[PDB]
Amino acid sequence: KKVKIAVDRNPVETSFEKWAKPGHFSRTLSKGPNTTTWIWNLHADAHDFDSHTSDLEEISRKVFSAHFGQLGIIFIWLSGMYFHGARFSNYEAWLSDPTHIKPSAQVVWPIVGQEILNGDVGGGFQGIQITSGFFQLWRASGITSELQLYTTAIGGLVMAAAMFFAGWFHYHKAAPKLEWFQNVESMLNHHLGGLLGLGSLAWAGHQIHVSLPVNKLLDAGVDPKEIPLPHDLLLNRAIMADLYPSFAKGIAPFFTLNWSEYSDFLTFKGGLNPVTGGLWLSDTAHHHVAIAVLFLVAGHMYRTNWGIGHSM
Amino acid sequence: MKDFTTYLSTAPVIATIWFTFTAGLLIEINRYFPDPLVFSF
Amino acid sequence: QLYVGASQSSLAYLDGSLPGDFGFDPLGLLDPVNSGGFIEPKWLQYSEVIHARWAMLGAAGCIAPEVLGAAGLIPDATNIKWFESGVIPPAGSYNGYWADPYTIFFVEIVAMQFAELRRLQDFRYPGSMGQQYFLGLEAIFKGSGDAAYPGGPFFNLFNLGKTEAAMKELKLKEIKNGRLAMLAMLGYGAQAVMTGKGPFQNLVEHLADPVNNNILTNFA
Amino acid sequence: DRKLWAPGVVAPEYLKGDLAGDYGWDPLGLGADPTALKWYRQSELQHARWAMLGVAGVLVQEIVKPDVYFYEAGLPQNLPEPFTNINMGGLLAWEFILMHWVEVRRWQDYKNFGSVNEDPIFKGNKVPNPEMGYPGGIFDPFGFSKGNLKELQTKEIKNGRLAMIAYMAFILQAQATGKGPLAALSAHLSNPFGNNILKNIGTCTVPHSVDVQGLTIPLTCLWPGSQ
Amino acid sequence: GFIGSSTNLIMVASTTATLAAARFGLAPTVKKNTTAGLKLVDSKNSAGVISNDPAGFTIVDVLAMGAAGHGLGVGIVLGLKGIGAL
Amino acid sequence: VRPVWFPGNPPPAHLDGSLAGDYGFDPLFLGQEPQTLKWYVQAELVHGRFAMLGAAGIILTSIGAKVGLGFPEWYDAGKVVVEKNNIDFPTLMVIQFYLMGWAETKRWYDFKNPGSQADGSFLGFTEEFKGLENGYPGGRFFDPMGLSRGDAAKYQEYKQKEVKNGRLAMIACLGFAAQYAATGKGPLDNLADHLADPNHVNFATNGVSIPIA
Ligand code: CLA
Ligand code: CLA
Ligand code: CLA
Ligand code: CLA
């Protein structure tokens, strides 16, 4: 077949000997510095992988593993934000009174008089009023606790370790061949159907089962400690049916094409929630379901290994 | 690990370590001896 | 090839030399050409056999308490659905073990760490595990050239499959029962999620009124 | 080694029938080391002989006096009249010293074979040693050896394996149904379908602890369940 | 009762229609692609795949046309539910 | 060939079966350089000897406090000692650092210069401070019984026993620390609590070690 997994086994030795030789990637920098222009060129040419070599296979392998590094770093950054919201935050206080409490997730150490930046943001808390929108995003996801943010941070660190391992693996241990990267049809099929289709479908599911009930109870004045945890909504269909009666019917209306039964949590209200000033999360869930279907059909467009599909 | 310690002896790593050290020393001096406008002790 | 879904591309490397080689490799994962990592044919066959043995232990263990309590041979306290045994405490847990599930889980960690890392070291270095002292047990841990079939004095305890054709037939029976049990475990999970009841309870309810107890009628 | 433990198995190449009761079993390969095989044969003989004595003792103790539980006969308040409520410390001292002597002698016979044969006080008397584990002489006073020794060793080790199994059976039955061997057999014969390993496994009749003249012996069962 | 409904019959009709269109040379299949002008022409199949049918109708074809017919029938059902014709 | 920490895994080339307690355990390759490996060998031996002393002292004082003698726990003995005896903790600490600095600088400058420390500069002591091997000083002062001298196989067996009991005592002191941080009580209080109910009383039933439950 033409679309297949193709890799070189152990192409590059994992060794520190090239860390100790700055400018190894270049033939014009491996000769060592004589001028400082060398010190600048070592950094300008570090990621110009097409000027290190000229064959597309090693370039593509370097690119793939560097993308894995970037993803690991983004995961470190996300885990850091979630952790600072779990440890150095006024988030649990902000849920109870979001209209008066300033979101803050960064506390400053009192060292050189800079504890003045730890301002009176609210919630019996002193810190830097953040502008990232992470509190609103977490309330939309239905967090309602610092423990969930802490465990999201731990998961993000695990995923960062996974990404860095994957970069090391896909460069040093089993690096894909060039013909694997040039499967743009399969790459697009998977990135539309899987990355965006299954991703939007999974987020729609989270919103059906976690975000919508948690935020419907939050908008009903229920204190976040009285709100059922997401797994109690997953397990007990009676609670969800009490919030959204269509859950009493199960997933039968989906398979019987009686989709209008789901108009309780799959809406087209448009506008804004008058309690929060944000979008209706039922509209958002329906949106993500719709674009999930759309991307999943879009990811069946290109021809990979069977006769159906398109050759771009 | 001769090559790893050669890497740690590189200009950027040594600079990072040395300036972390200097900044931490100054920060601890300013924590234990706060607000030193003049040499009076 | 047999097993509809097989392809001329998959039959290029599926010679029929592996147990359960029915040509079904539509995604072409057993192609040895330019395939390393864990998509190596050796590792994939090994993992199929391992998932098979674990899964046909589990396909019997998820059904056995319910069947033995239906027969009245075990008391009703141990007659439980497999997911309310302590494996998924939210779905339910059993209170009457000799220890709490995490003590037993640490015992499991140590035991299975030992066992599975011995297994791994014999996969990575086949000639190993018969070389270092293990309380005399290293005489049965010599294994074979194949990792999924060590077949020493313990792992082949009754020396079954003495000829090559008998061993091949037995490997085929093993992998077929194991694929069946892997599907049975996937079905156990799917039925526990959908119906919320045990696999034997689902079987009984389908055998009583099949037209009104099926995957379609259980969507509600 | 002929007529092995299973119809289709092969004997390991270190079990060739030179030991008595050799069915070539060794599925864990523990006897692959000859040193360990010698030591394990000695431990097999020890467990076998002590278990033959043990089943004989439990049986004859239930037959002579069924008044007393063998699981509780070690308690000092259940001891015969010349020894009732005896101090278990001095008793344990007697046993400890008198068994340390003989077991260290046996162990030195294992280490240096044929070095502790002579009496150490009256140095005119030497126990023989045809094999390690079979001293003879004062230990074979009736002289049943110097005849078919291999056949008698086979009989010994077979009855000893059986007695090991049987004594662990006694212990587990006493832990499950709280009865002795013959008591359990008669309780089975009384109702051989409502009194068996079913409806009796899962319940341990052994207490959580037992006070013995001040000490508290922890008193476990061999499996979990019901106190 | 769903079996016998208008929805059920619409769906089975759509799926069988797409399956019969592909099997009998009225829809692109694994073995027959279309050109820029929609004329069915033999494809290269990119793997080669075995089927004992007289027409080379794969289970990949059954999957493709079941998905196409399910989309068709879903759209038809929900559009007749939309205009009130169901 | 030789027992390895991870059976099947070949040992690294820098860990030949020559040092005591050599099981080929160097996943981070920290002792790949020979001089660094000598330094780490002496570090392991010093750590393990201090940890053997510490485990023995903690165990003995815990036995004494458990049977009822006048003993505090290891986490309370410093305060009890400096307050029962009117001992100035600064004075004690600087005396300790003076003496241990003398001793450990002698150590350091015998490591840097093995031929050193035996010139007779200290008090005329020449051969009492020359050192037999790296980490094994020996002599009439550090080995008064002469157990390194005489039987060599016994000396190698003793080196193995020393390094292994030292690693075990390091693990034991780490365990004392973690057990105080978790259970908040002494080591033999922990042991008695475990021997009381081995199940339901272990690290899985503190809520500290396993926070899942
Ligand atoms: C997906 C994003 C992406 C990717 C993968 C690349 C990748 C690449 N670019 Mg492109 N580029 C991008 C985005 C991207 N770029 C954007 C957004 C711009 C506009 C700014 C450019 C503009 C650009 C130019 C103009 C050039 C490249 C070049 C390159 C190549 C080498 C770059 C290198 O070695 O720098 C290594 C990294 C550095 C030297 C670090 C730069 C640090 C910046 C200047 C400071 C900013 C840091 C921070 C945000 C500020 C606060 C810092 C604090 C300490 C004060 C490489 C193929 C070069 C090339 O191909 O040469 C032939 C080249 O000439 N890129
Ligand atoms: C310890 C593990 C390890 C080791 C020994 C090596 C060893 C090697 N790698 Mg591999 N690699 C690893 C892990 C490892 N890699 C991982 C985890 C990845 C995934 C990202 C890769 C991806 C990778 C690629 C894609 C390439 C290598 C290359 C190399 C060679 C030299 C690299 C070099 O000069 O390093 C020294 C370089 C660094 C120390 C830079 C690290 C930068 C990190 C990843 C990002 C940090 C960003 C930071 C947060 C920014 C802060 C900004 C600041 C202002 C705050 C050498 C054989 C190169 C080669 O030519 O091999 C033949 C090559 O092209 N490796
Ligand atoms: C990816 C997205 C996603 C996910 C994961 C879920 C998941 C779930 N939904 Mg939701 N849902 C979604 C999207 C999603 N939904 C969307 C888009 C809609 C709008 C149409 C809905 C509308 C909806 C309604 C209206 C209802 C649900 C319900 C449910 C639950 C019942 C699942 C069920 O019956 O299906 C069956 C699923 C399976 C049979 C798969 C289980 C397979 C298991 C995991 C196999 C593993 C076995 C393993 C191999 C062996 C054991 C392992 C080990 C122990 C040995 C479940 C929690 C119902 C419920 O009860 O909610 C509380 C309900 O009433 N959903
Ligand atoms: C951009 C992401 C990316 C991409 C494109 C690849 C691509 C590849 N990887 Mg790499 N890999 C990645 C990330 C990625 N990997 C990460 C993050 C890890 C660390 C966890 C690895 C670890 C890894 C190993 C160890 C191996 C590969 C292998 C492969 C090859 C075949 C994989 C395949 O088809 O199996 C199909 C995929 C599976 C069988 C995985 C199913 C199980 C996973 C956990 C589920 C997928 C995650 C899902 C999207 C999100 C969770 C869903 C869940 C909640 C339901 C191919 C070159 C193999 C190879 O041939 O070597 C190159 C191989 O041995 N990869």
Ligand code: CLA
């Ligand atoms: C029906 C399922 C099945 C089948 C056909 C096989 C078949 C085979 N296995 Mg696999 N295996 C299975 C399940 C199965 N196994 C499971 C669940 C496990 C995990 C516990 C294993 C673990 C395993 C290992 C580790 C090894 C094998 C080996 C073998 C081969 C040797 C012959 C054999 O096992 O007897 C044929 C099987 C049967 C007749 C099945 C009978 C099923 C009954 C219920 C079992 C008897 C129960 C009884 C109480 C067992 C204890 C006896 C005694 C101690 C009291 C053969 C290919 C060995 C091999 O390939 O060496 C060359 C080998 O090394 N298998």
Ligand code: CLA
């Ligand atoms: C010297 C060995 C030793 C011994 C005999 C004990 C004995 C005991 N411990 Mg302690 N403990 C030890 C080491 C030891 N511990 C170490 C090293 C730690 C730190 C991880 C702890 C932390 C600890 C806690 C937090 C608790 C106990 C408790 C207990 C008691 C019950 C057992 C238990 O909960 O499991 C604990 C058993 C272990 C942690 C395993 C033993 C040590 C392993 C084998 C060390 C392995 C190191 C490995 C070889 C190399 C590491 C590097 C590697 C990761 C790359 C029991 C008296 C509990 C108690 O107080 O009982 C009431 C309790 O709550 N222990």
Ligand SMILES: CC1=C(/C=C/C(C)=C/C=C/C(C)=C/C=C/C=C(C)/C=C/C=C(C)/C=C/C2=C(C)CCCC2(C)C)C(C)(C)CCC1
């Ligand atoms: C936030 C975050 C995090 C977490 C995350 C998560 C948690 C995620 C999840 C995710 C998920 C959890 C996902 C899931 C998914 C699922 C899916 C995607 C499903 C699908 C399904 C389907 C597609 C179906 C199909 C079908 C049907 C419909 C019926 C039957 C047949 C079939 C099967 C074909 C972390 C830690 C990382 C850190 C960072 C951030």
Ligand SMILES: CC1=C(/C=C/C(C)=C/C=C/C(C)=C/C=C/C=C(C)/C=C/C=C(C)/C=C/C2=C(C)CCCC2(C)C)C(C)(C)CCC1
């Ligand atoms: C054997 C045979 C036969 C018969 C056969 C048959 C009967 C078959 C069937 C087949 C079938 C019966 C198939 C089916 C398929 C289906 C499918 C494949 C489905 C799919 C689905 C989907 C894909 C979905 C999608 C979606 C959703 C989910 C939502 C909405 C949107 C959309 C639509 C996208 C004959 C002729 C006789 C002869 C010989 C051979």
Ligand SMILES: CCCCCCCCCCCCO[C@H]1O[C@H](CO)[C@@H](O[C@H]2O[C@H](CO)[C@@H](O)[C@H](O)[C@H]2O)[C@H](O)[C@H]1O
């Ligand atoms: C393939 C895509 C899905 C992948 C798997 C999805 C992850 C599911 C995680 C486990 C969730 C367990 O919960 C899921 O099964 C339970 C058992 O029937 C259902 O529980 C429901 O049925 C039970 C039995 O009648 C009753 O307690 C209630 O009616 C109700 O609680 C939940 O309504 C459902 O959400």
